[PDB]
RNA sequence: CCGGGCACUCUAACGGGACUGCCCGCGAAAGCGGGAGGAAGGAGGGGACGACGUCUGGUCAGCAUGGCCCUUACGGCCUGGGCGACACACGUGCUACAAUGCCCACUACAAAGCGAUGCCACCCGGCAACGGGGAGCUAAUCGCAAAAAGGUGGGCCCAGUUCGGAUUGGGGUCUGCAACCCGACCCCAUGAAGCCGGAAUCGCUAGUAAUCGCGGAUCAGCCAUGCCGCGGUGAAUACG
RNA sequence: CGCGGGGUGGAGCAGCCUGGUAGCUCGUCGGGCUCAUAACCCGAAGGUCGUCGGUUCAAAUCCGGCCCCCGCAACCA
RNA sequence: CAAGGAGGUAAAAAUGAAAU
């Protein structure tokens, strides 16, 4: 019954960058608890960003996250055996989490061969507003758009 | 290939040694 | 088959592989520790009794 | 005709006369019951007062239950003049 | 229910051992069997003494054995028998230094094994169990105890129906470690079966 | 190149291409090209015809392989035809040869499930 | 490795160490929030501990025990068989379906435990399992063990394909009186199903889930992918 | 005995006329949900088309002979 | 700043188990 509001977990800043965000992204890359392979892939992809574009990956990655941020999402709620879906706003914590999660997932959805090039490209596509994650973001906002009827149920 | 008897990895998992996994040096 | 069966367990002749462990306090053939010569059941009894030198509850 | 057993003790008493699977004082009791279930051509014959016959309910539907003694039952499926799955169990 | 043996629960701090010797492997097994056969042989022809403990100590062929008894009446002055061959019959499968001592347990009403054994005798005397429990507790409580508790379980007064008679005065905290709680148990053999008597005796600590 | 009974594997490393023959596997593979003295990491694409001839001549001879040894293997099972042993009956019933568990599993010899129900 | 030294690390024996004691705010009190205080905090993180009682719960096959029954036998010994059977159904699992992947070589970084009726260094034969030798070790001395994921290099290049390892043929080793029913490994050749799971269903809130190997018990051997432990790298999220 | 209709998985019905595909509900069998049963959800299996002949390259289907089932008709003296 | 008197009321979900 959540007596405690569960305090927000804080991370360690990365190497060379100091991000309070990049490490969170590396973590999503991480599988089976191998931060070595995870971090390597991201920094690898950072080197890949430099090639296809003359931009610093610290902004390319930053803007990509900003473009894959759900303004509002759909929430299933009350009365009628939980029949309604109230479109709710998204907390900065949750926009944060969804952005990075959808990025990595869409990144591994790509037909490319190497994990680094998937990350790099999906970030470049998302920075422009083209990524498959941006599709996911825009999709979730469609659902939230179509439910404005009983949005006044709010909460 | 943790169950293939023709790998250093499968030989680890099985425990035993052999040609695919020599007893060091 | 229990009395004549704790006989064989101490008799131990005829082929070396036909010989087997067996709790002494009981007659248990399973979970017999070589260290005490007892089954897991008896061992627990005596450990609570205090009749097992040094043997003490494990908490960590 | 009894055609299949689920209880080994019951099986041995009727087949070989091996009594070491049942209680010793219920040997005659269990015997007369089994012979009755063997001779029975329909469930209606297994209806003597001393048997307290009844079909079981729930997941045991399709089964029957005559009383040996106390809380002890012989359960089975009777079908077309034959009983199957003769079990000895608690009520 | 399910509760751990209040003796084993201590062992380390509060309540020391009962067989205090050290050995490595290849020896522990043999010496423990001998040790237990001593306890087994003693219990038989020494029950009339009512022995609270059977402490045992060793030091390479030394085997010391301390028998705690309420009333050591069965020792009778040196060559008055009841000790001579009696402490010498141990070495018929031992052959080691059968050093048998005898202790005088002062108050038997504060020795848990003795309490339970007195109760278990009364069950076999066909006594009224509930009244026997009550008295034994008060008897223990009468001899200065800080808390007591006796438990007989099963087949009380014969009669087809296993029961459990319960009585306890004062304080008996089993969960506490600094407890000094003596635990005893006894089998009452009856013509209608077997029932067990637990006895808890408690004193202060800190 | 039609090495034994097969020819299929083109541009894909001779130590690997060799594997595509019933009788070669992996150990006999590098064993054959070190004994014939050919580079394992080659193209397989019809390289030096001489290396291919030597390879073919050694491999196809030496030990039995392809359809010939399939016949021998099948004949070794036909050994336990006649009035054969227990191991033959396991080849007869279609059940596992090495006495394993057949109460469950053993689907690789029994085949897919049939389901009786009762 | 020696001389020597034992301050560091470790080893294991007793101790010191926070009790929201100190500051602000709230309150009648308990207490709650917040802050320098320090390794630590408002039961620091885990163990052992399971009230009166409940389930005619479980256990006469650990053992004890009332009653009933068996005694040239419902007891006793032996050889062999069976518990391992298989048209099927459910549970708990292990290995996978690949490229944050697999293979080969090189090179690092643990803890907790076990061993002189055994662990077996280093050589020698052997593709290997293993066999011949044979040193040290009653073991923080010697041995089991190189930890493995990791790192470096190189090779496959996305196809059931160097993924996957089932199944089967042949040849061998070791324990054992003996391994056909029914043992574990080693080597050659086969290389199946599976390309990620229907209705449903499980675990876990911080060293935690996931992933990686290591030890022990029982043990001649071993059907252990189990159980009990050990450490390595190490997430996500909790509005409510 | 005269006309008309009909025999199809276990049950009840389609498909026949415009020959090459046998389909539907229920039941059955497997698996889920539940302490359990029912309901519900998932997934399967199941038919000599009454029978004997004939036409066809091919017959549940088109054509005859019997075999049952159903419905009409059997009037004037 | 403290409430009495007034009114719309959940859903679709049925059974019972085998000597006192
Ligand atoms: Mg044993
Ligand atoms: Mg088998
Ligand atoms: Mg407590
Ligand atoms: Mg019961
Ligand atoms: Mg018994
Ligand atoms: Mg079994
Ligand atoms: Mg396939
Ligand atoms: Mg594929
Ligand atoms: Mg929790
Ligand atoms: Mg069903
Ligand atoms: Mg149901
Ligand atoms: Mg007219
Ligand atoms: Mg009804
Ligand atoms: Mg009722
Ligand atoms: Zn025992």
mmCIF file of C-alpha atoms (C1' of nucleotides) in Angstrom, chain B residues 1-9 11-14 16-21 23-25, chain G residues 94-96 102-104 127-128 130 146 148-149 164-165 185-189 212-213 225:
data_model
loop_
_atom_site.group_PDB
_atom_site.id
_atom_site.type_symbol
_atom_site.label_atom_id
_atom_site.label_comp_id
_atom_site.label_asym_id
_atom_site.label_seq_id
_atom_site.Cartn_x
_atom_site.Cartn_y
_atom_site.Cartn_z
ATOM 1 C CA UNK B 1 27.335 -24.361 -26.346
ATOM 2 C CA UNK B 2 27.314 -25.410 -22.695
ATOM 3 C CA UNK B 3 26.196 -28.938 -23.580
ATOM 4 C CA UNK B 4 28.480 -29.660 -26.534
ATOM 5 C CA UNK B 5 31.325 -31.993 -25.543
ATOM 6 C CA UNK B 6 33.584 -30.358 -28.142
ATOM 7 C CA UNK B 7 34.172 -26.927 -26.644
ATOM 8 C CA UNK B 8 36.210 -25.440 -23.805
ATOM 9 C CA UNK B 9 32.856 -24.064 -22.647
ATOM 10 C CA UNK B 11 33.970 -29.102 -21.091
ATOM 11 C CA UNK B 12 33.849 -26.524 -18.299
ATOM 12 C CA UNK B 13 30.136 -27.087 -17.770
ATOM 13 C CA UNK B 14 30.603 -30.864 -17.808
ATOM 14 C CA UNK B 16 35.857 -32.941 -17.345
ATOM 15 C CA UNK B 17 38.838 -32.083 -19.573
ATOM 16 C CA UNK B 18 40.181 -33.432 -22.855
ATOM 17 C CA UNK B 19 41.321 -32.539 -26.364
ATOM 18 C CA UNK B 20 38.928 -29.601 -26.707
ATOM 19 C CA UNK B 21 40.072 -28.427 -23.281
ATOM 20 C CA UNK B 23 44.719 -29.488 -18.525
ATOM 21 C CA UNK B 24 46.529 -26.140 -18.931
ATOM 22 C CA UNK B 25 49.821 -25.585 -20.788
ATOM 23 C "C1'" C G 94 18.788 -27.906 -17.592
ATOM 24 C "C1'" U G 95 20.559 -26.528 -22.895
ATOM 25 C "C1'" A G 96 19.166 -23.645 -26.722
ATOM 26 C "C1'" C G 102 29.476 -18.521 -31.356
ATOM 27 C "C1'" C G 103 34.556 -20.754 -32.120
ATOM 28 C "C1'" C G 104 40.378 -20.654 -31.173
ATOM 29 C "C1'" C G 127 44.797 -36.452 -30.265
ATOM 30 C "C1'" A G 128 42.244 -37.180 -25.490
ATOM 31 C "C1'" C G 130 43.667 -41.857 -18.726
ATOM 32 C "C1'" A G 146 43.794 -22.595 -14.259
ATOM 33 C "C1'" A G 148 34.434 -18.162 -15.262
ATOM 34 C "C1'" A G 149 31.670 -13.759 -17.264
ATOM 35 C "C1'" G G 164 21.850 -25.586 -31.730
ATOM 36 C "C1'" G G 165 23.083 -29.963 -29.506
ATOM 37 C "C1'" C G 185 33.791 -39.635 -19.221
ATOM 38 C "C1'" C G 186 37.097 -39.481 -23.853
ATOM 39 C "C1'" C G 187 37.750 -39.585 -29.502
ATOM 40 C "C1'" C G 188 35.818 -40.111 -34.875
ATOM 41 C "C1'" A G 189 31.356 -39.607 -37.806
ATOM 42 C "C1'" C G 212 29.160 -16.047 -14.428
ATOM 43 C "C1'" G G 213 31.954 -19.789 -12.495
ATOM 44 C "C1'" U G 225 21.101 -30.051 -15.031
#
